[model samples]
Target: SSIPGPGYCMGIGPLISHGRFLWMGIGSACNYYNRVYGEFMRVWISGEETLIISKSSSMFHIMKHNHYSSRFGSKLGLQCIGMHEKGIIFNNNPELWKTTRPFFMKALSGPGLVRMVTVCAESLKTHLDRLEEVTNESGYVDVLTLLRRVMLDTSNTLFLRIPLDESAIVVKIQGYFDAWQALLIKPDIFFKISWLYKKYEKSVKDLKDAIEVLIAEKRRRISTEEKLEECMDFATELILAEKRGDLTRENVNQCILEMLIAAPDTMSVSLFFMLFLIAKHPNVEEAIIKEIQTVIGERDIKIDDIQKLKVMENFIYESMRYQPVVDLVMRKALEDDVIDGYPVKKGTNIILNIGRMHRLEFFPKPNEFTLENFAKNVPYRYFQPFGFGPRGCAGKYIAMVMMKAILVTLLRRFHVKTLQGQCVESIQKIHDLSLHPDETKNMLEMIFTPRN
Candidate 1:
């Protein structure tokens, strides 16, 4: 009942020992260990022997069961932001995460989903229509950048009842993300952390102010009426929750901030890379277009419409399997645990290698991209792009609806190709797409000709 994972001194595992991880990076490094160790490896990160796990069974136990539910992943690195026990993702305490979850769910319930769909329809069509006009000028659009803005504006509309457009606000929020991710894997020796986070506070606080202003509006709306419901937007949902005594004002701000912080890149790349894959294969693009036309022609896109587009649906799943928005999911064990006869120490950092697992094991012909791979039903154990269980991504439904909605909007309106007259080889054999984007590499080039 006791088999120790492969290990090394001072984190001697090749990936982290001499900072090999820095060069090889998160994916390949874990890929190496997973190939050699076959599931679990005691890799060095943050001055400890963290468990680099790709084993589905172990991941299931860690995710599904209650004992492993605290999302203390990378400790939230928010010591500078001071959001412990404040929001959903990094809620350090289990009890806090458990109760606050209802508020998160309720935010997306009936009216919240409707609000998201409406906002996505409005914001996406507006921005894409404008892009379709300008794209003809250059024959291409800065797709990655445009996707980021659309995600921000739509998320802004949902969360603040307004959009953060034309400012360096998207750029600024992206700035904080870099810091948050760095802090994610670091040991929290905040030597220079405070200085940078001080700047982040201003931008974050500026949004908080807007959220406050809207809250005041909603609060007044409630006083003036008996059936005062603010379910049109998630921001209103949260404010309504606070008004109804379900959550405090602090919860409202933190939830909004966390929701905004979480969405952009995850959703954008989910679309960015999916579109990237579709662009590579004229065959796949035709499939998507056909599905769109056959399933919902001249009809409004809705949750049901999105569901009906099975080709697009499979393309989305295949892309997520191929180039998922998240590379890894970091979990901190709540207590001493054992998985599949393997010892998982208490408080040990457990990282699920989603890329490796999705591409390496669960799916067939691991390296290639194809809808046939997922033709038959795959269980959550095999295809958890959004993780699984209680602490799974609350944004899954939100992401799917937007991804489906946006892609349908584009294909119906324009012919999207890789770039102006050139193309990236359509996703075929063994290659990867990126979700975590940096300053230079973040921008993806694409061509969009208006459809006749």
Candidate 2:
């Protein structure tokens, strides 16, 4: 039987559409297809035939079967600093993935969590000190901007062992975010248009140059300086792994580069949305604060305290379920096969429609932002804030701890409120590489008055 879908573009043959995700359009399409076709549906974008799996069962199938990865794996090398050779995000080859995955896991795990929490706390304190000072004077602050800096400070310090001053580099990092979103929305346009390509190229160069300099400086410090610490940052870990011949220099550079480029943005966005949700519902904020006080009892939130804050953790999960950073995740089928009786062809782009999946029949009152939804033992694959399957986010543990640390610090000190007396729905969602608040409208403002 023919899989149901909208009509294809005439010239493009079987293609449904011929462009990238228009944030709103994709959401609407997913909702429509989900209502019409149930779990599995077909669509086409950019002349490529695609299948969208919005149900948890099909998602699990895709996750369990390792024959799928991003379609951009082949072009990542040419697109960004030999990324094809280094990182696991775009890597599809199982053997190469096996070789590289462990190093990252080891570097980000073990004794790393303790050091990571310390670095995150230190960086976060510096930002919050400035934030408290400024927000006290100004009465309101751009929550997004401050949060981005905090995440950047944490990511850079945690991975590269370098903290960015409030200077051109932070601006350049923001530029990279913009460039990245643009490329994701319409990648073909970036390459086709010279000016656009140059903008992206310059951003990539600026970021890469910073990473290279930091790598060299750290290498020198480790060599010449006495009393080298055992608990080194990620860059040092990669360097040590390189010395052991576990991975290549290109791999080190690209992995660090990818972290620098991707990590901060994701952390900040998640923080922003989580904060927005709390601000939107003052009771939720109260519950979180109560949870914090109950768990830590006015003490600082250490890494160990994270797991103890069950209510806070549930709040974060609920926030993610309501508003995920990556609205959709794409995986490319390596060969033609059947999944759950559906015919999936080779090179078929498998779109995991997260927005729809969250609202499946199993989730009661799926639209509401209720914590009890998570209280029940839902399947892990059903609510993937850090993503799902074996390919789930490696830095998720660190990300959660960092977010909790920042929240505890900020909420303990201040009472957060939305500036316009608006709820989360008031802030229009911009469909970029990840979902973001509509920056142009200034709708995401928050007031952070000091709590007595």
Candidate 3:
């Protein structure tokens, strides 16, 4: 509204009005530039840009205030789940959120996550042992698949507090994978055309029912037992604490499902990327191994000793930088606002291309994957893998710990890399809102050479 013109300007070129799109000529190369500093350009479908004030402030404001209405309600109903569409993630501003977050935070506190590390480590070691057993001295192992299974075990044990040994793992993983795949395809089409919805629906229901049974058993134990310290499972704590004035059944379950979504998929994918980058660049891998060796003095890492390995931290950072698991941070325009002088109209969906930003012109060798970028620390906002600002990854702490633990513990015992002369390629694939590399082979497979 500020500019009553046929066209508006952003960066160096003018964005002309076009149907449902603001057309700015992206040269053979895609790079963003702005001739006017702090000028926010809003593009209508017709490609006309409206010049306005900065909307970043308002973007953050509405994000913090109206989380729900901005999500499940605002969009063209793209990513809705069944009855829980208006669940936690969908609930705009409500008392439900106020009541739920504390209970979740309390249940999943730093100590709680850390306490589960032993279980996580046990799960990882079991999977690795299997790999070590089956892998011929020369036979390769699929790092991503193995890692995904391990991640599933880790997540399962943490919540279920039971050994989901191989049989249970395969069954659950297959079902969950089906459910996951179904969810990614448009639910409407999936539900309408396929029998998969029933299977997936049953998978979810069965898991929930199993969890309910666990909850009941834990409640039964609580009737006779009083000590909270003796309890081992998250489900127990969640069930027992349900009566507290702060907790709600819906939010607790929502948080549980959120845990599954956050832990296994992203962690395994990120781990895959990290290993792929490291394998491709042996010098980096050797350097990290050297750091681990020098620091630990021929020792396997104890969970408490993770802080001693800075190289592992840097490696994960580099991996996320190169093949980021998450591509963008999408937020709805709560109210009409300006960013860099362009009007971001209400209901407008802003997708900050994090992957693109990583390859920005400002970043040196943006396309190259390097741990040295992290070696020279930048401000948090400048280099974000866990995202910038408050609504960042909730499990960042646990994710870091898990990643570091895996690297330090395993790197000490073996040398891992892709098999000799394996072709490496990244392909375009979409699962939900995420975009991974094009034709990506499941992170390079490797032979684990036993350390002498």
Candidate 4:
């Protein structure tokens, strides 16, 4: 019953101060531990015995128990290139996650959801012709580097069909996900002449030498093309799951480098934290630009008009319950458990935290940022931002249809805001304290202007 963490260490406890408080202030590390241990607590990381709950009736006790289905990294930063266990977000092998989770959920939708709305409306109309030459010479536009370069140029042109841009490979896959998230946080350190494990082994040898020229251009298009599985994307469904031996060719190039890293790490951090909370809610940006000009007016964006806007899908679930890219969801018990009432041993490690279960108390203005806080329904454990049962998020419907086709094609021709002394009065001070890298690039420098 008594679970209020931190106080017991042997070989490891406050490892790098709880790994920079779980990846540096994940949305204010559940508002300072749910305002000092409210939902539930217990910690000791690395030397094990962790808990952290944040209540959703124990957040479905490891999201709907199957013995709290595994998932607790750092068997020493789970190896490199040879991903600790092949693909599907650290596949804890259940017969290779039942042969690569049904062809990676059949490569996300019929005809791969029509090649993700023609590759994100032709990669944001050729990135809005280089965002009109950098928004007419840097007047503004660092939407955290313009929505992570249009979600890494629309997820490397929807899973590498083309545009490796004369192949430098998008800044070498963002330098292999910034040296694989700082060498997958030193749970069990290795100092192999450090330097972030030698830039995570030369960013896994330059992404396996650019996946060996993308598998020698898919083995010269299956030797003189014809039926290279009719290009139905996701790298031709990982080249038909390595010619039906159901994955291996180094687990289909680590499942095409984890679907080019699950679409720009959750749609460029949930479309720049829902355009930095709809740029300080000018009435939720004119009700999502009047519901994107009355749901599809002057043409273009279609994919069933992203389910008829509906106040821009409840302002993208109230800006993912007021700013969240993914605020923790671990598991690892495998037997012997119970949450809201304590006791959960078998190798312990629950965590859910869910940014304090998306700011608890069954949210009705859970710290107001209203779109009627998702207008209705909202349950899936206090609105999880793509973290639910059986390892969710296979690019959660390509991140809600490419964040509603890149916010209805740039909020129907620009109007983003938030510049003055870089706004953000904790409207998500955009993570990891003392932020500085020129104040996180002026917190994604705003004012995307124009919409006259």
Among the numbered candidates, top TM-score falls to 2
lDDT tens readout by residue for model 3, 1-452? 34322334453233233211212221101112212332233333212232222233433343344441333222212233322432343434445544444444554556666765566667777777788643555577766667777777777666655433444444454454445433532313334654534666666565555445545554577667767667445565655566563456655554555555456557776776676666678888787888887877665456666776787777787677767776545444556655434455665644444555566524556677766577677654556566533344556677788888776666667776666664234433443344433324443567777767
lDDT of 1 by residue, 341-360 (tens): 87777777677888778866
Task: Tell me the TM-score of model 1.
Answer: 0.86
For each candidate in turn, the TM-score is 0.86, 0.89, 0.74, 0.33
* Model 2 lDDT per residue over 284-370, tens place: 788888887888777766778878877887888788888877767767887788877788888887777776788774677798899
Q: How many residue pairs clash in model 3?
A: 35
Candidate 1 Cα misplacement greater than 4 A, ranges: 1-29, 73-76, 132-137, 163-167, 190-227, 230-232, 240-246, 420-434
Candidate 1 lDDT for residue 208: 60
What TM-score does structure 2 among the candidates reach?
0.89
Candidate 4 per-residue lDDT over residues 105-174, each given as its tens digit: 7777676666687678777777766865445355776665556566767766656665455225545665
Clashes of 1: 1
Q: Against the unseen true structure, what C-alpha lDDT does each candidate score?
A: 0.68, 0.70, 0.53, 0.66
Which of candidates 3 and 4 is the stronger one according to lDDT?
4
Show where candidate 2 strays beyond 4 Å. 8-10, 13-16, 20-38, 69-82, 132-137, 185-190, 227-229
lDDT (C-alpha) at residue 56 in model 3: 38
How would you order the candidates by lDDT, starting with the best?
A: 2, 1, 4, 3
**lDDT, residue 110, candidate 1:** 62
Between candidates 1 and 4, the TM-score winner: 1
